[PDB]
Amino acid sequence: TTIVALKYPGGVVMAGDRRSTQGNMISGRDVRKVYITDDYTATGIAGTAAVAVEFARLYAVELEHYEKLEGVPLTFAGKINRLAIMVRGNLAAAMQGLLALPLLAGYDIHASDPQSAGRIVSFDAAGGWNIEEEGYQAVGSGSLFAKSSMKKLYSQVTDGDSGLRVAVEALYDAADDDSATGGPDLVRGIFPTAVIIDADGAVDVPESRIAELARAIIESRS
Amino acid sequence: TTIVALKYPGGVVMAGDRRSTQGNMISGRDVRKVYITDDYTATGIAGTAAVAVEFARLYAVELEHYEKLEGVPLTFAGKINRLAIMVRGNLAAAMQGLLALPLLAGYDIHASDPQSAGRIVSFDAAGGWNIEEEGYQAVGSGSLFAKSSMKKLYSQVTDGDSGLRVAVEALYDAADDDSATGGPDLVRGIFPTAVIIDADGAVDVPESRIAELARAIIESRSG
Amino acid sequence: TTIVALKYPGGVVMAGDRRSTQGNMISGRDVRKVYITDDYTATGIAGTAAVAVEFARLYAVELEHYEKLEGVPLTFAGKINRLAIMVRGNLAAAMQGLLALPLLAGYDIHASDPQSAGRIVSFDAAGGWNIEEEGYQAVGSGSLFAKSSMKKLYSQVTDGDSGLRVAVEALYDAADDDSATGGPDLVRGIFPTAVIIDADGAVDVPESRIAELARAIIESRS
Amino acid sequence: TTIVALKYPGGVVMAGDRRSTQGNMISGRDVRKVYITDDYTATGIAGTAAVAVEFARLYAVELEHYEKLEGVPLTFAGKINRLAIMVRGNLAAAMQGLLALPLLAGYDIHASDPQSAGRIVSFDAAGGWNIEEEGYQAVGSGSLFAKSSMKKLYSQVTDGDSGLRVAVEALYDAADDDSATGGPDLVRGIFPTAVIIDADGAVDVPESRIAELARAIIESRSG
Amino acid sequence: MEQAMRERSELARKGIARAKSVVALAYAGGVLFVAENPSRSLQKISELYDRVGFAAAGKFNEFDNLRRGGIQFADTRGYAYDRRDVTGRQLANVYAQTLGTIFTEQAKPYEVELCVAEVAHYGETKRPELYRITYDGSIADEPHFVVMGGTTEPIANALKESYAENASLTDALRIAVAALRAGSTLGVASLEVAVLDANRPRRAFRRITGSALQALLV
Amino acid sequence: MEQAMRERSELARKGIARAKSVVALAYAGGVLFVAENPSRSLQKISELYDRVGFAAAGKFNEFDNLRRGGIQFADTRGYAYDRRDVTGRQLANVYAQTLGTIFTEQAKPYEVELCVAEVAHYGETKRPELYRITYDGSIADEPHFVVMGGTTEPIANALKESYAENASLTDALRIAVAALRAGSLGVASLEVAVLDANRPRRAFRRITGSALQALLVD
Amino acid sequence: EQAMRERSELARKGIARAKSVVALAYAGGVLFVAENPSRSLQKISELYDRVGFAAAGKFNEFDNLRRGGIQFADTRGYAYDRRDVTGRQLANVYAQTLGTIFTEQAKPYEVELCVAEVAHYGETKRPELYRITYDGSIADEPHFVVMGGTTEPIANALKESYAENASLTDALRIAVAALRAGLGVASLEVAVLDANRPRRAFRRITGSALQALLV
Amino acid sequence: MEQAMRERSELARKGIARAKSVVALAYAGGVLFVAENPSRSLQKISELYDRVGFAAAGKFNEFDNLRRGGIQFADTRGYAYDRRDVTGRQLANVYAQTLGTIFTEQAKPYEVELCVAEVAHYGETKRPELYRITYDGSIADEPHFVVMGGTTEPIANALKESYAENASLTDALRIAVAALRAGPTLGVASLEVAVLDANRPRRAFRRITGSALQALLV
Ligand SMILES: O=C1CCc2cccc(c2)Oc2ccc(cc2)C[C@@H](C(=O)NCc2ccccc2F)NC(=O)[C@H](CC(=O)N2CCC[C@@H]2c2ccccc2)N1
Ligand SMILES: O=C1CCc2cccc(c2)Oc2ccc(cc2)C[C@@H](C(=O)NCc2ccccc2F)NC(=O)[C@H](CC(=O)N2CCC[C@@H]2c2ccccc2)N1
Ligand SMILES: O=C1CCc2cccc(c2)Oc2ccc(cc2)C[C@@H](C(=O)NCc2ccccc2F)NC(=O)[C@H](CC(=O)N2CCC[C@@H]2c2ccccc2)N1
Ligand SMILES: O=C1CCc2cccc(c2)Oc2ccc(cc2)C[C@@H](C(=O)NCc2ccccc2F)NC(=O)[C@H](CC(=O)N2CCC[C@@H]2c2ccccc2)N1
């Protein structure tokens, strides 16, 4: 798996690949690993598929649970802490191969500076959390290829559309070097999923636009 | 074991072999591994016989228990989740040799398009679940032979009968390469079992139609 | 141990050997391993003597306990389930050497066709149960030899007497090849025990009949 | 240890040696291993001395406890079951070296025919129990030598006295081949103990009768 | 002690009398349940097991608690043994034990009255069994019909006159609706109707709602 | 204290007095139970163990609870020790302890009156034993017959002058049915069973249908 | 008998002294209107996607029940699926819960609850409204529910001035008018279950938007 | 039932009415608490969290228990989620639930009256919030002022006359003391004064003692 997240002027993008494996065998081609967790928050998870799926589902209900109980959503720091506590609670099972590693992207409506409300938070198997300040981050078995790809391409991020194209290209580079990350499938018509978050909230990116960016990247490579 | 499931226009088919083993020894010849779990749902389980049969019986009770308590059946997604949670709760025993790997086929009465209302869900030993979108799936020791056979045969699936034929031929290929999967037994008259589910519900396929299709596959391959 | 069971028109027969061992040493010559569990059911158990005896005794009490509490006996399927649950609950001890492997024979008084109302159910150490449909089964260290003998002999089974004779011959072949299964003892006059169940219920087979059949087999093979 | 028990017309006899060991070292010369556990039963125990002694004492308390609570003694089969459950409950400690292996002799006042109302019940470390029907049994490290001796001598048993003589000789043969079984000590005047049970109940056999029989056995072996 | 239990008895009897009425009767195809119920979603009749049905009168949350307890008991029994081991008699038996305990020990007695009905298994011929369990745990085995809730006696005597064994479904539905009207207009908008259909292969319980019920009321 | 126990004793006595009648008596073949019961599924007489039977009068759910507890006690006892170690005296002793605790501690006393009967094992010669346990835990040893439920004195006196030791099953049955008539009777209104001392192990057996009619006619 | 009569009296009198709440079905789903002088303490709430909650009576008590229903709905939606949570079963568990409270709690709850469900997006299904009283009695209502204070004037006013498929503006003025017979932005808590929303139908109508809806 | 809660409300009314009085007012700098307290070490006004303050009237040990319990709740909530997720609305809600449980379930209801107040965080412009919670769990949020303990209605109407929104600090203090004497001279020895100062960077609660407090009363 590779999940990428990067900040653009006034927002954030998160994109993830579509592959699941069972050892060497490919066991899934259309896995959706990027979740809209609430109106202003998306999470992408890598690891054991069962644990990752369960994590995204339960995290979303926990955030909405608090909102309905108290009448207001959690502060962004509170959302971070609850996701970290969930990973920390899974540590013993994670050491036995039931590992979930999440990546958190969001837009803080209560941010001090409304121009810089984008948020990227990465986590570790121990529940550690770090608010990323260099503009991008990744998680999964291709996260190093994706982060090194983004280190070179991030200067091109000037708006939401160029940030999306960079995120998709970083996923393309990760799939290029990591057989556990799936690249665009032009035969079946399957492409990474993406979520974009700005002041108007988080929305799913249409598949047609991702397919367009993927085809352009493929043509520029060949 | 090999259980197969595939979508056809209007419904779904699930079929499974009849063999049990203890090591190299054949210990059963008429095992029934495909269960009608409710009126629109079929479950086929592979793994340790004792655990597999207990999973199927408990799962069917659980779905009916909810239906009677709440007056309405579970949504198909609710049925998926209960089956997944059952597998997850067995993970520790499964690591000690008490493994159950189910496969789920169903007809969603609340789906959008009635001709795409067929559903197929595969699972793993950790309680993972994945709704299949490519039209077919299998589980068991012969599942890779079956899936690779259905990959080449799926195009001829246009209705319920042709879907049944493909399912039986996949099981035949599975038993051709996997000794833990049973092929048709022409001397004893024992054949795979099958369930078809459409808008009218889930029904067992009569042994006669499966026998006719198996003989057709057999003499087609013998010349 | 070898315990056999076979169906015949209108009933079922179960027979078992008399030997117990402690390693290579013979520790018992008179063991009764086939129990009339209730009026229409017989249970035969292989494995660790202490556990097998306790299983038979507890199972019979459980069946009668239900009948007195509820005014009606369990259905035969319910009887299968309770025995399977007993074996499943012993699995941990069975992995520690306290193994009980039962074989169940019965006559279902609620079956439609009384000619085929006989029932034979085999079990495994995980509590698996399988209703046999080929007419015979066996359990114990000699069960392979007995099942292969019955395979060649089952065509001779036309009634209770010939079913009993085949059962005794299978036990003879098992003891012929398995030193942990006791043959007929002519010096001491000790012979396998047997239960036969039909629409009139289960009855112990008199020792004299089994002696007759055992001597006939011995005479024939000499 | 060796403890023997055998049936004679109208009763049973049980006899045990007097030795305790700690490895090769002799740690006891007058151990009493055959306990009158109620008016009609005796228990002889081999194994770890502490566990054997506690077993005999607790078992006799349990039988008398039932009798006072319920106003009647347990049936002989009830007595067997309580002993077997006691042994079964010690299985974990026995696997750690705290092993007790009893042998039970008794006279069933409720038996059908009073001539064969004698009962000999052997037990194993899992709590298995087996009523013996061939006339004699033994338990302990010398039990094989004792049983093989009784196999040859049992035809001489016609009454209580010859039954006691055969039991004493069986113990002699056991000590002859098993260094963990004590033989008669003519220097210290220490001999095996014995209990006889008939319709009149269980009584200890006077050591002087045991001594006379042992000396006669020693004289015959000498020439 | 003696008037405390009689006060509990009167509280429960009053609660049952203030609720609408329910009828269960044996017809040719099994057992018919007909209850006066204006609600569209809140039910007084229910499936318990394959061939066992449930009807109640009184306070909803209390007989719904007992309905759920019965399903729990039935499903647990069928799983722990076999489906065929579940009977209407033992369901009525445990309802009698439970209501007896509630009537003597709970803070307030249950203002409920229960009917448990069982029809034959598929392909087998056996007369339907009807059981009544009252608020105190008393249990009665009836052969033809059971009336529960509200003014019961006029409905009971209307059935006492017009009931006929092995009547058709439409005849039984007419007799039941008429007997209910004797105790107090009743149409599809104010009726809850279901049957235990002995011709069903496994699950005999099926509801009759809307167009089908209107067609059988004419 | 003394009024509390007088009220509880009165509630229980009245509840038993308003109940249908049961008798049990020794005869040549063992023990016979007859009770006034119109139900075709509910039972007041039951097997407890091999040679031990049970009969009750009063509220059904309460003596069915006690019937079940007694079966639980006997099966556990015979398994922990041996079958022959279970006796009717033990079960009566248990019922006396149980009913006494119920009478002093439960919210409402049990309105029950129990008979426990034991016959001899197969081939043994032993007088039948009959135990009566009342609602307060009091226990009585009876040698000839036991009557429970409702108006007892007419039935008791009818049996007194009419009881014959070693009577036939037919004779003793007619005697018991006639004694029941003195108070509050055909196949449809009777539950009858015997502890048959000639059965090899399970002495309990019910007498219903055509066989009960044949025994009732002559 | 006297214990239950006193408990019913305490609950009935406590509810009779509380402010009133109305819920009614309109063309856009369900509309909740309650007299509430507070700006932060609320009597109307979301329960699940298409399920809403309204209460009259003692605040701490119906708030306990509000949180309890939220815990129930989220637990059931997670143990099964979101679509398996219904308004009917929420009202069912409220009836069971209040029945237990009424008979066993140290003091009965002085509360009256409404559970309402609208259709999920894209589906045409008539709204459902349930009234659950302090003793666990449960009522199925087709058009509107009134709770708290003197209910008869409000109910009758709604009974003659209720229009099926009425607009949001018309339904809102009918509700405020019916409540008046018992009112501005500062003294009203208003929220709707909007059947046109894609998932979460609950939305509060507050301040300037509420003023525009009234005028 | 009615008698129990009647006497409990009566007991709590008398205990609160006997105790001394406390007032909380919203002013331009945040929220000000003024209470009559002659003790030097026993405090009625207290910090709860960053921007949340606490004031009480009644029996000391009881509102001290409630003060500590609110500190446990807020600290636990801020650690489990984040500091900025702790609000005065939340703590007031918890106090209503807690006092409701105490009033109905404990051996004696608490004779306390609670005020929870929150002011804006540093750099923000948000209207202050005041909450009043009574001995039975009744809760109401006020816009301007809250009065507790002693004879409240004179003080409440006095403030209703002499309250000015966004008034000065010393202005509001003299307004509060003037309303406090309406129910003769109140100096530093008779007063406990604190504020939730919306201008402090995190911990808004700060006490006003001795020299400073006296300077504010000239
Ligand atoms: O390998 C397995 C079996 C469980 C297992 C056993 C032993 C070691 C182990 C994991 O250890 C492991 C083995 C393999 C992995 C992790 C751990 C990689 C991981 C993955 O691809 N993960 C990508 C991914 C990320 C987020 C969300 C979903 C998702 F698939 N793969 C997995 O867990 C695979 C997944 C798989 O085949 N199936 C088939 C049907 C259901 C399940 C699926 C669920 C949901 C979506 C897609 C697929 N399970
Ligand atoms: O091997 C065993 C013994 C239990 C065991 C011990 C050690 C390791 C182990 C399993 O580990 C294993 C050993 C063997 C397997 C798995 C795990 C393969 C598996 C199988 O064939 N499974 C096919 C199958 C699928 C679904 C339903 C039923 C069914 F048989 N076989 C099994 O578990 C076999 C099954 C078997 O022989 N018997 C004989 C009578 C009852 C039981 C049966 C039940 C029901 C139907 C058909 C047969 N049990
Ligand atoms: O070998 C032993 C020692 C106990 C033990 C502990 C842990 C693991 C284990 C064996 O490991 C084992 C060792 C041996 C076996 C299994 C496991 C085979 C098994 C057997 O023969 N079983 C045949 C049999 C089948 C059904 C009923 C009774 C019966 F004897 N033998 C056994 O358990 C033997 C049995 C034995 O000697 N005695 C002497 C007196 C009491 C007991 C007996 C009871 C009842 C009837 C006949 C004998 N115990
Ligand atoms: O060896 C020991 C130490 C305990 C031990 C440690 C580790 C392993 C182990 C046993 O494992 C063992 C080591 C040795 C044995 C068993 C287990 C043989 C066994 C024996 O001879 N037993 C004969 C015997 C049978 C029945 C009743 C009494 C009786 F002594 N010996 C024993 O347990 C010896 C006994 C012993 O020396 N003493 C000295 C004083 C008290 C004790 C005694 C009590 C009562 C009577 C006579 C002696 N204890």
CA distances from D198 to D8, D13, D74, D81, D117 (A): 9, 9, 18, 22, 8
Q: How many helices (H) and strands (E) does chain D have?
A: 6, 12
Residue with structure tokens 């059904």? F60
- Contacting chains of B (3 CB pairs or more, <8 Å) are A, C, E, G
Tokens of G200: 């979460």
Enter the DSSP assignment of C154. G
Q: Is the dihedral of CA B88, B94, B96, B98 positive or negative?
A: positive
F116 and F33 Cβ atoms separated by less than 8 Å = no
Minimum Cα–Cα distance from C123: chain B residue: B50
**Touching pair F, H by Cβ (3+ pairs < 8 Å):** no
Enter the DSSP assignment of D156. G
Tokens of G204: 């509060």
Indicate if A158 belongs to the active site: no
Residue with structure tokens 């092993």? D99
Amino acid sitting at position G111: V
Which distant-in-sequence residues (6+ apart) come within 8 Å of H81 by Cβ? Answer: A66, A74, A75, A77, A78, A81, A82
Q: What is the 3-state secondary structure (H, E, C) of B93-109?
A: HHHCCCCEEEEEEEECC
CA-based nearest residue to E57, from E45, E74, E65, E71: E45
Minimum Cα–Cα distance from D63: chain F residue: F81
The DSSP secondary structure of B49-115, one letter per residue, reads: HHHHHHHHHHHHHHHHHHHHHHSSPPPHHHHHHHHHHHHHHTHHHHHTT--EEEEEEEE-TT-S-GG
C204 and C194 Cβ atoms separated by less than 8 Å = yes
Ligand 3 touching residue C3 (CB < 6 A): no
Gap from CA of B119 to ligand 1 centroid (Å):
20
The DSSP secondary structure of C17-75, one letter per residue, reads: ---EEETTEEEES----EEEEETTEEEEEEE-HHHHHHHHHHHHHHHHHHHHHHSSPPP
Which member of H2, H100, H141 has the closest CB to residue G39? H141
CA distances from C119 to C115, C146, C197, H17 (A): 11, 18, 10, 84
Distance CA D96, CA H112 (A): 65
Name D106's bridge partners. Answer: D41, D119
Partners of A201 on chain G (C-beta within 8 Å) are none
At E50, give phi and psi (nearest 5°): -50, -50
Element (H, E) at A134: none
Distance CA E46, CA E195 (A): 10
Q: For C10, left (φ over 0), alpha (ψ -120 to 50), or beta?
A: left
CB within 8 Å: B75 and G86: no
CB within 8 Å: A78 and H90: no
- The C-alpha angle E161, E167, E168, rounded to 5 degrees, equals 135
How many domains does chain C fold into?
1
Q: What share of chain C is helix, strand, coil (3-state, %, to 5)?
A: 40, 30, 30
Gap from CA of A1 to ligand 1 centroid (Å):
10
Q: Using CA positions, which residue lies closest to atom 21 of ligand 4? A: D20
C-alpha E4 chain-centroid distance: 29
C-alpha C25 chain-centroid distance: 24
Enter the DSSP assignment of B156. G
Task: Show which residues of C are catalytic.
Answer: 1
Ligand 4 touching residue D53 (CB < 6 A): yes
Q: Using CA positions, which residue lies closest to atom 27 of ligand 3? A: C49
Amino acid sitting at position E133: I
CA-based nearest residue to B122, from B199, B32, B14, B194: B14
| CA A25 to ligand 1: nearest atom | 37
CA distances from B195 to B33, B134, B173, G21, G22 (A): 11, 20, 19, 53, 51
Kindly give the residue spans of alpha helices, DSSP state H, lying in H81-148.
Answer: 88-105
Q: Using CA positions, which residue lies closest to atom 8 of ligand 1? A: A97
Distance CA G30, CA G194 (A): 7
How many domains does chain E fold into?
1
At E194, give phi and psi (nearest 5°): -155, 165
Residue with structure tokens 């503006």? G169
CA distances from D206 to B150, D197, D200, D211 (A): 88, 14, 17, 9
B12 and B106 Cβ atoms separated by less than 8 Å = yes
Distance CA B119, CA B105 (A): 6
Which distant-in-sequence residues (6+ apart) come within 8 Å of E32 by Cβ? Answer: E23, E24, E25, E26, E169, E172, E173, E176, E193, E195
CA-based nearest residue to C35, from C11, C54, C8, C7: C54
Gap from CA of C23 to ligand 3 centroid (Å):
9
CB within 8 Å: C124 and B22: yes
Ranges of beta strands (E only) in E28-92 are 30-36, 45-49, 52-58
> Is D22 exposed, middle or buried (CB count within 10 Å of its CB: 0-12, 13-18, 19+)?
exposed
Ligand 1 touching residue A117 (CB < 6 A): no
At G106, give phi and psi (nearest 5°): -60, -40
CB within 8 Å: C50 and D84: yes
CA distances from E64 to B72, E55, E95, E205 (A): 15, 10, 13, 17
Long-range own/partner contacts, residues D204-211 (CB < 8 A, 24 or more apart): D204/D36, D205/D13, D205/D15, D205/D164, D209/D164, D210/D15, D210/D164, D210/D168, D211/D184
User: What resolution does the deposited structure have, in angstroms?
Assistant: 2.3
Name C21's bridge partners. Answer: C26
Gap from CA of G83 to ligand 1 centroid (Å):
26
Enter the DSSP assignment of A29. S
**Touching pair D, F by Cβ (3+ pairs < 8 Å):** yes
CA-based nearest residue to B104, from B141, B78, B65, B70: B78
Distance CA G36, CA G185 (A): 10
Enter the DSSP assignment of A190. B
Q: How many residues does chain H have?
A: 218
Name D119's bridge partners. Answer: D106
Distance CA C142, CA A190 (A): 58
Ligand 3 touching residue C83 (CB < 6 A): no
| CA D22 to ligand 4: nearest atom | 1
Distance CA A108, CA A130 (A): 16
Kindly give the residue spans of alpha helices, DSSP state H, lying in H128-209.
Answer: 152-162, 169-180
Gap from CA of B128 to ligand 1 centroid (Å):
7
SS3 of E75, please? helix
- The C-alpha angle G122, G127, G132, rounded to 5 degrees, equals 145
The answer, for A65 touching chain G at a CB cutoff of 8 Å, is yes
Range of the domain at A145: 1-222
Ranges of beta strands (E only) in F4-59 are 22-27, 30-36, 45-49, 52-58
Distance CA E117, CA A195 (A): 56
Instruction: Tell me how crowded residue F210 is: count the other CB atoms within 10 A of its CB.
Output: 8
Which distant-in-sequence residues (6+ apart) come within 8 Å of B145 by Cβ? Answer: B2, B173, B174, B176, B177, B178
> Is G67 exposed, middle or buried (CB count within 10 Å of its CB: 0-12, 13-18, 19+)?
middle
Distance CA D151, CA D140 (A): 17
The answer, for G45 touching chain A at a CB cutoff of 8 Å, is yes
SS3 of B215, please? helix
Which distant-in-sequence residues (6+ apart) come within 8 Å of F107 by Cβ? Answer: E104, E105
G17 and G56 Cβ atoms separated by less than 8 Å = no
Instruction: Give Rg (Cα) of chain E.
Output: 17
Residue with structure tokens 């708030």? G63
At B192, give phi and psi (nearest 5°): -55, 155
CA distances from H89 to B123, C20, D26, E67 (A): 46, 77, 83, 41
- End-to-end Cα spacing for chain E: 53
> Is G199 exposed, middle or buried (CB count within 10 Å of its CB: 0-12, 13-18, 19+)?
exposed
A69 and A123 Cβ atoms separated by less than 8 Å = no
Distance CA B198, CA H191 (A): 81
Instruction: Tell me how crowded residue E206 is: count the other CB atoms within 10 A of its CB.
Output: 14
Distance CA D135, CA D138 (A): 11
CB within 8 Å: G38 and H140: yes
Partners of A75 on chain H (C-beta within 8 Å) are 81-82, 84-85
Mutate to test the interface with B, among E79, E83, E202, E205 (most CBs of B within 10 A): E79
F95 and F104 Cβ atoms separated by less than 8 Å = no
Range of the domain at E45: 1-218
Distance CA E99, CA E110 (A): 8
Tokens of C41: 């059911």
Ranges of beta strands (E only) in H121-211 are 129-133, 139-142, 145-148, 191-197, 205-208
Residue with structure tokens 């059952």? B86
Which member of E39, E59, E107 has the closest CB to residue G140? E39
At E109, give phi and psi (nearest 5°): -65, 155
Residues D81-111 as b/e (b if ≥16 CB within 10 A, e otherwise) read bbbbbbbbebbeebeeeebbbbbbbbbbeee
Sheet holding C201-204, edge to edge: C136-139, C3-8, C11-16, C193-198, C201-204
Which member of B58, B61, B69 has the closest CB to residue E68? B69
Distance CA A145, CA A151 (A): 10
SS3 of H168, please? coil
CA distances from G30 to F113, G53, G105, G128 (A): 61, 11, 32, 9
* Experimental technique: X-ray
